[PDB]
Scaffold this motif. Structure first.
Motif, PDB file in Angstrom:
ATOM      1  N   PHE A 188      33.011 -16.241   4.420  1.00  0.00           N
ATOM      2  CA  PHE A 188      32.171 -16.327   5.598  1.00  0.00           C
ATOM      3  C   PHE A 188      32.073 -14.967   6.269  1.00  0.00           C
ATOM      4  CE2 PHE A 188      33.488 -20.923   5.521  1.00  0.00           C
ATOM      5  CZ  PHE A 188      32.247 -21.451   5.540  1.00  0.00           C
ATOM      6  N   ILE A 189      31.012 -14.833   7.055  1.00  0.00           N
ATOM      7  CA  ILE A 189      30.758 -13.646   7.838  1.00  0.00           C
ATOM      8  C   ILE A 189      30.797 -14.011   9.320  1.00  0.00           C
ATOM      9  CG2 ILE A 189      28.947 -12.023   8.561  1.00  0.00           C
ATOM     10  CD1 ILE A 189      28.018 -12.185   5.575  1.00  0.00           C
TER      11      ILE A 189
ATOM     12  N   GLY B 212      27.441 -23.659   4.522  1.00  0.00           N
ATOM     13  CA  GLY B 212      28.132 -23.016   3.396  1.00  0.00           C
ATOM     14  C   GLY B 212      29.316 -23.781   2.809  1.00  0.00           C
TER      15      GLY B 212
ATOM     16  N   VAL C 230      30.991 -21.872  -0.029  1.00  0.00           N
ATOM     17  CA  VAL C 230      31.691 -20.732   0.558  1.00  0.00           C
ATOM     18  C   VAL C 230      33.026 -21.175   1.172  1.00  0.00           C
ATOM     19  CG1 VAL C 230      31.625 -19.031   2.449  1.00  0.00           C
ATOM     20  CG2 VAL C 230      29.583 -19.478   1.017  1.00  0.00           C
TER      21      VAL C 230
ATOM     22  N   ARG D 178      26.588 -20.451  16.031  1.00  0.00           N
ATOM     23  CA  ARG D 178      27.530 -19.426  15.566  1.00  0.00           C
ATOM     24  C   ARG D 178      27.363 -18.074  16.225  1.00  0.00           C
ATOM     25  NH1 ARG D 178      27.993 -19.631   9.121  1.00  0.00           N
ATOM     26  NH2 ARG D 178      29.321 -17.807   9.657  1.00  0.00           N
TER      27      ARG D 178
ATOM     28  N   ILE E  44      25.063 -12.224   9.429  1.00  0.00           N
ATOM     29  CA  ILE E  44      24.631 -12.832   8.172  1.00  0.00           C
ATOM     30  C   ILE E  44      23.257 -12.303   7.816  1.00  0.00           C
ATOM     31  CG2 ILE E  44      24.056 -14.933   6.930  1.00  0.00           C
ATOM     32  CD1 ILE E  44      26.044 -16.374   8.881  1.00  0.00           C
TER      33      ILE E  44
ATOM     34  N   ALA F  51      23.474  -8.898   6.321  1.00  0.00           N
ATOM     35  CA  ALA F  51      23.992  -8.887   4.959  1.00  0.00           C
ATOM     36  C   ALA F  51      22.895  -9.351   3.993  1.00  0.00           C
ATOM     37  CB  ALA F  51      25.200  -9.813   4.903  1.00  0.00           C
ATOM     38  N   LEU F  52      22.158 -10.395   4.379  1.00  0.00           N
ATOM     39  CA  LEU F  52      21.046 -10.846   3.550  1.00  0.00           C
ATOM     40  C   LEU F  52      19.943  -9.801   3.429  1.00  0.00           C
ATOM     41  CD1 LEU F  52      20.802 -14.480   4.849  1.00  0.00           C
ATOM     42  CD2 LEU F  52      21.603 -13.811   2.536  1.00  0.00           C
TER      43      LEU F  52
ATOM     44  N   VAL G 274      21.940 -21.816   6.944  1.00  0.00           N
ATOM     45  CA  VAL G 274      21.952 -20.517   6.292  1.00  0.00           C
ATOM     46  C   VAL G 274      20.949 -20.509   5.141  1.00  0.00           C
ATOM     47  CG1 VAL G 274      23.392 -18.811   5.143  1.00  0.00           C
ATOM     48  CG2 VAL G 274      24.254 -20.008   7.110  1.00  0.00           C
TER      49      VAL G 274
ATOM     50  N   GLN H  39      18.275 -17.612   4.655  1.00  0.00           N
ATOM     51  CA  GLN H  39      18.041 -16.909   3.383  1.00  0.00           C
ATOM     52  C   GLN H  39      16.554 -16.929   3.010  1.00  0.00           C
ATOM     53  OE1 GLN H  39      20.503 -19.340   0.823  1.00  0.00           O
ATOM     54  NE2 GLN H  39      22.431 -18.415   1.514  1.00  0.00           N
TER      55      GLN H  39
END
Ligand SMILES: CC(C)(C)COC(=O)CSc1n[nH]c(=O)[nH]c1=O
Length: 252
Positions: free
Chosen positions: A2-3, A35, A38, A176, A183, A186-187, A219, A223
């Motif tokens: 997780f992030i 996730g 994950v 979150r 996130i 990062a994506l 998520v 994405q």
């Protein structure tokens, strides 16, 4: 894997750490697009068996009549399409962790066989009467309400109470905090690599929108949105006009 360190994810991380040292079954729930794999992998990675295999079986991504073959394996000619002998997920996972994702997709007959296996470690390949055994730590996950599934007779009560030892409810993306943009960054970098682009930042209105929208697909939906932006646009900065529908329409 997780992030972020949002308040609700801190709680998840404490349970992952404490659960990782136990063999007790973990039962993950959460909204669409959270996730679950994950989380399962993070438990394995934090556990003493981290050097052994982590195997995920997605029960939904296999025809229902073939989950048993995927899970327990099959001998040659066991059924019409059995072109060869197959090693089951349970063998791949021996001494490691097995994630049973979308577990409620199993038919009741298969659930009975799974429960025997969970109780004893023993199983049989499809097409064979010979017994084998393995040692796996189980992590289950579902997008259904597993209690509802039990009430409606689609999921065995005995199986549910055998599995539901360490429940983990994953926080939805809208709850979150600062994780959403972490996130997204990062994506953005990963999709830029995939597409041959160079996006590095979001404009302030886009940050505000991503931090206010309800992300009903969580998520996975994030994405999709980042993929959309990176595939359809070429810039260093994500601008509000790039955000696809119906993100703004629904937001309002
Ligand atoms: C870019 C990255 C590979 C980290 C993306 O991975 C996914 O989106 C998986 S799902 C997920 N990852 N990280 C989270 O913090 N929450 C998630 O649900």
């Amino acid at each position: 894997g997780f992030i972020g360190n949002s308040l609700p994810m801190q709680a998840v991380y404490r349970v992952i750490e404490s659960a990782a040292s136990s063999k007790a079954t973990v039962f993950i729930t959460g909204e669409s697009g959270t996730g679950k794999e994950v989380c399962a992998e993070a438990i394995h990675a934090a556990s003493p068996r981290h050097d052994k295999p982590f195997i995920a079986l997605n029960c939904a991504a296999i025809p229902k009549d073939l989950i048993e073959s995927e899970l327990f394996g099959h001998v040659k000619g066991a059924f019409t399409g059995a072109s060869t002998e197959r090693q089951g997920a349970v063998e791949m996972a021996h001494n490691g962790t097995l994630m049973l994702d979308e577990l409620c997709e199993m038919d009741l007959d298969l659930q009975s066989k799974l429960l025997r296996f969970i109780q004893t470690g023993t199983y049989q390949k499809v097409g064979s009467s010979k017994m084998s055994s393995v040692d796996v730590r189980f992590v289950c996950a579902t997008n259904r309400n597993p209690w509802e599934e039990v009430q409606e007779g689609r999921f065995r009560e005995d199986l549910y109470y055998r599995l539901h030892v360490i429940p983990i409810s994953l926080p939805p993306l809208r709850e979150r905090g600062g994780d959403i943009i972490e996130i997204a960054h990062a994506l953005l970098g990963l999709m830029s690599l995939e597409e041959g682009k160079s996006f590095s930042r979001f404009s302030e209105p886009v940050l505000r929108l991503f931090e206010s929208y309800s992300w009903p697909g969580n998520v996975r939906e994030l994405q999709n949105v980042i993929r959309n932006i990176v595939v359809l646009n070429t810039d260093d900065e994500v601008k509000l006009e790039m955000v696809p529908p119906p993100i703004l329409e629904h937001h309002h």
